[PDB]
Amino acid sequence: TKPFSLPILTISELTNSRFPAPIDSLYTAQNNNLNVQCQNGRCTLDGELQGTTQLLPSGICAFRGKLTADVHQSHDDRWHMQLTNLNGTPFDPTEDVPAPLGTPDFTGLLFGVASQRNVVSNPNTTRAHEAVISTTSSQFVPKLGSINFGSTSDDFQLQQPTKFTPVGIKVESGHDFDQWAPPRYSGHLTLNMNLAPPVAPNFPGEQLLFFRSNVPCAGGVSDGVIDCLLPQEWIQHFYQESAPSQSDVALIRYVNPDTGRTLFEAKLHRTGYITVAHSGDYPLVVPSNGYFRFDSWVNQFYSLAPM
Amino acid sequence: TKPFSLPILTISELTNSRFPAPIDSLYTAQNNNLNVQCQNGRCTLDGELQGTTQLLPSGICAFRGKLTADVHQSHDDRWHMQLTNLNGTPFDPTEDVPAPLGTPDFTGLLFGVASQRNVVSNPNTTRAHEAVISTTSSQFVPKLGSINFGSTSDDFQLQQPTKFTPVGIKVESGHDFDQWAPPRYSGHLTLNMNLAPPVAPNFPGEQLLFFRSNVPCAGGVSDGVIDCLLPQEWIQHFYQESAPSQSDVALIRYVNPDTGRTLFEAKLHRTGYITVAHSGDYPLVVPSNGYFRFDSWVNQFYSLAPM
C-alpha cells in the first residue's frame, strides 16, 4: 500500500549527488553507447544505496584519515593519506563496496583543501591548504586504504587527523577530465569490484535525463560539467521512505505548480535513473518553480509522450 | 491529524545547519545568559524557514555573484564581490530577511575558495584560489548587496561570475572567532533586521542541546566548534512534511534501535530548538546507532526526566 513519492523541490533546491554543488539544469544526451556507470548518486527507488553512495552532501568526494608519509622523492603527489571512513571508523577493505563511501567516481584532478587539527601534540593547532588529488595517480588506491595529494604548501604534519574538503576540478595537460570513467579504486592493473551496475536506456526513442551541475575549476578550459542520475535529496528521501517499488518503472510528470499543468513525462526506473522520449542533446526548457511528481507505476509496454 | 515526525538518522548521517560539516557530537551547555540567536539553521516544526536559512547544505556560508572592483589601495580585503542570490536571481535588499540566505551568522574569519568561470570573454576559462572573508570587516555588508574577500593570489578578474565555497574558519590576532555574535549585515553603526528570535531555556533545570561540529581551521589555535540548533536534515524534513505543531513542545526520545531502549528525553520546541534537563557543560555519552524519535505533544507543565 505505502505510496512512493518524490520530495517537493525545485531545481535550485536540489544538490548534485556526485559533487557538492547545486543542480544548475536538466539535460538529456544522445545515445552514443557510452558506459554510464557512476558510483556516487546511486540508489534504488525503495531506498537501497549502491556503489560508493552515502547520505551526506558533505561526504561526496571527501576523505578523512591521517598522513603517514611524505614521499616527495618518489612522487609529485607527496602526501600519503591513510584513510578511515568519513564517520571516523576504521576502513575495512573487505567490505563489499568498490571503495570507501564518498570516494570520487570520475577520472581527473580533484581540487580542494586539506586541513589538520592536532589532538595531543600541540592540541588544537591547525593548518589548511589547497591540495589536489589525481584519481588517475598510481597512489590513488582508496580501496586499499589510501590516497595521495599534492600541494604547493609544505605545511603539513604526519600522524595528525587530516580532512580533504572538495571544492572543484582542475584541468591541465595530460589530465583531461572524464566524468564517465570511474577510477581504478585498487590501482593500476586491478579491476574494480562491487560496482553499481551500468545504466542505459533500453526502450526505442528514449535517452537518459541527468541533473547537471557546472562545478568550480582551478584553471584550464572546462565547463565543469558533472551529471548525476538522481539528486541527493531524492536519495535521502528514498532512504527514509523505503516505499516498495511495485514495478520496474515509475511514471513521473514535471509540473508547474502555479499554473497546475504538466510540462512533460519521464520514466523513473527502479534502480535509480530517469529516461525521456527525445532524440538529441538538449538542455531542458523548464520553469524555475517546476518539479517532478510521482504519477503511477507502469509496465514494460508503456510508451512516453515525446518530450 | 497529520503526524509530526523526525527523519531516522544517526549522528554520523547528520549535517550542521550553520556550516557544511558532519555533526560530530551532541552537547549541552550551562546557562550563562548568552544570547543564542543564530540565523542559519532556523526553522519551525511545521516547516517555516527563518533568518538566513535555506535548504542546500552547499548554500550554507556560500556566496555567489561577481567582482566589480579591486580596492587594494583602501582595504586589505581587496576584492569587492557584488552578490546575487545563491540560485543566481538578483539580490533584493527589500526582502524581509536579515541578509541573502546562506550568509554566515558568526563573527570571525571565514576561510574558503573563490572561483570564477568566464562566460563570454574567453568562455570557460577558469581560476580558483584560497580566499578569506572577514565577517567583521567594514566591507562585510551582505544586506546592502556586497562582501569583500582577501587572497594571497592576484589571479582574479572583474565582471566574471564568481563563487565562494566555504571550507573552514581562520584564527589570528585581532580576529577572535565568536560563533554566537551575528555579524552586522548592513555594516558598522547599522542594526540588524528581520532576525530569527533569540532562543533560551525558560523552564527550571533545563539547558539547550546543540548538534556540534568541529570544522576545519586554516591556522591558529581553535577547536573549530560550531553548534547548531537543528540538523539540516531535520530542517529539510520539516519543510517537506509541514506537519502542524499541536502545542508549543514536542517530547522526543533518544532511542537505541538495536536494544530498543530509550536513553533520555528532550523537549523539541515549536520554534526549532531543543532543551534537556541537566545542569552543567556536558558532551553526551550516546551510542553510534542512536537517534531521536517523536514521542508526543506536551503542555507547559511537563517536566523532563533528568538527563
Q: φ and ψ at B158, to 5 degrees?
A: -85, 155
Residues of A in contact with B127 (CB under 8 A): 218-219
Per-residue DSSP letter, A279: -
Inter-chain residue contact A55 with B126, CB threshold 8 Å: no
For residue A264, what are the β-bridge partners? A254
Tell me the residues of chain A between 9 and 48 that have a Cβ less than 8 Å away from chain B. Answer: 9, 12-13, 15, 20-22
What span, in angstroms and rounded, lies between the C-alpha atoms of A34 and A56?
28
Alpha helix locations (H) across chain A?
232-241
User: Of A215, A44, A23, which is closest to residue B55 (Cα–Cα)?
Assistant: A23
CA distance A216 to chain B (A): 6
**Residue A117: all three cell numbers together:** 587539527
A233 reaches B (C-beta below 8 A) = yes
3-state secondary structure of A59: helix
For chain A, count helices (H), then strands (E): 1, 14
3-state secondary structure of B217: strand
Query: Taking the domains of chain A in order of start, what are their residue ranges?
Result: 1-59+171-307, 60-170
User: Of B46, B86, B82, which is closest to residue B66 (Cα–Cα)?
Assistant: B82
Question: Is B213:B252 a contact under the CB 8 Å cutoff?
Answer: no
Report which secondary-structure segment, H or E, holds B237. Answer: helix B232-241
Tell me the residues of chain A between 86 and 145 that have a Cβ less than 8 Å away from chain B. Answer: 86-88, 111-113, 115, 117, 124-130
User: Of B214, B128, B112, which is closest to residue B167 (Cα–Cα)?
Assistant: B112
- Chain A interface, best mutation among B54, B56, B61, by max A CB count within 10 A: B56
What span, in angstroms and rounded, lies between the C-alpha atoms of B17 and B50?
12
3-state secondary structure of A112: strand
3-state secondary structure of B2: coil
Question: Is B9:B233 a contact under the CB 8 Å cutoff?
Answer: yes
What span, in angstroms and rounded, lies between the C-alpha atoms of A44 and A245?
9
Inter-chain residue contact A224 with B126, CB threshold 8 Å: yes
Q: Do the domains spanning B1-59+171-307 and B60-170 agree at the CATH topology level? A: no
User: What fold does the segment set B1-59+171-307 form as a domain?
Assistant: Nucleoplasmin-like/VP (viral coat and capsid proteins) (2.40.510)
Please report, as a single letter, which amino acid is at residue B82. Answer: Q
Question: Is A26:A284 a contact under the CB 8 Å cutoff?
Answer: yes
Question: Is A166:A110 a contact under the CB 8 Å cutoff?
Answer: yes
Inter-chain residue contact B224 with A127, CB threshold 8 Å: no
What span, in angstroms and rounded, lies between the C-alpha atoms of A238 and A57?
15
User: Of B112, B176, B179, B122, which is closest to residue B147 (Cα–Cα)?
Assistant: B112
Q: φ and ψ at B96, to 5 degrees?
A: -85, 65
In Å, what resolution does this model reach? 2.0
Which residue in chain B is spatially nearest to A116 when comparing CA positions?
B216
Inter-chain residue contact A58 with B86, CB threshold 8 Å: no
What span, in angstroms and rounded, lies between the C-alpha atoms of B216 and B165?
13
What span, in angstroms and rounded, lies between the C-alpha atoms of B227 and B41?
10
What span, in angstroms and rounded, lies between the C-alpha atoms of A76 and B258?
47
A235 reaches B (C-beta below 8 A) = no
List the Cα angle B141/B145/B151 in 5-degree steps: 65
Residues of B in contact with A217 (CB under 8 A): 115, 117, 126, 128
> Nearest Cβ partner of B223 from A112, A113, A124?
A124
Q: For chain A, where are the E strands, in sequence order?
A: 25-28, 63-70, 79-83, 109-117, 126-134, 146-149, 161-170, 206-214, 225-228, 249-255, 262-269, 273-277, 282-283, 291-298
- Per-residue CA distances from A119 to A127, B148, B155, B189 (Å): 13, 33, 35, 40
> Nearest Cβ partner of B113 from A167, A219, A233?
A167
Residues of A in contact with B112 (CB under 8 A): 113, 167
Per-residue DSSP letter, A2: P
Question: Is A133:A61 a contact under the CB 8 Å cutoff?
Answer: no
3-state secondary structure of A210: strand
Question: Is A86:A159 a contact under the CB 8 Å cutoff?
Answer: no
Residues of B in contact with A125 (CB under 8 A): 221
User: What fold does the segment set B60-170 form as a domain?
Assistant: Elongation Factor Tu (Ef-tu); domain 3 (2.40.30)
Q: φ and ψ at B12, to 5 degrees?
A: -80, -5
Which residue in chain B is spatially nearest to A122 when comparing CA positions?
B221
> Nearest Cβ partner of B219 from A9, A113, A126?
A126
Question: Is A305:A253 a contact under the CB 8 Å cutoff?
Answer: no
Residue with cell 566591507: B139
Count the neighbouring beta carbons within 10 Å of the beta carbon of residue B22: 23
Q: φ and ψ at B167, to 5 degrees?
A: -125, -35
B263 reaches A (C-beta below 8 A) = no
Inter-chain residue contact A117 with B217, CB threshold 8 Å: yes
Q: Regarding beta strands A79-83 and A206-214, do their DSSP bridges make them parallel or antiparallel, or are they unpaired?
A: unpaired
Tell me the residues of chain B between 267 and 286 that have a Cβ less than 8 Å away from chain A. Answer: none
User: For residue A85, what are the contacts with CB-CB under 8 A and spacing of at least 6?
Assistant: A64, A91, A100, A101
- Per-residue CA distances from A216 to A20, A57, A107, A274, B306 (Å): 10, 16, 16, 26, 49
CA distance A234 to chain B (A): 12
Tell me the residues of chain A between 170 and 209 that have a Cβ less than 8 Å away from chain B. Answer: 171
What span, in angstroms and rounded, lies between the C-alpha atoms of A195 and A208?
20
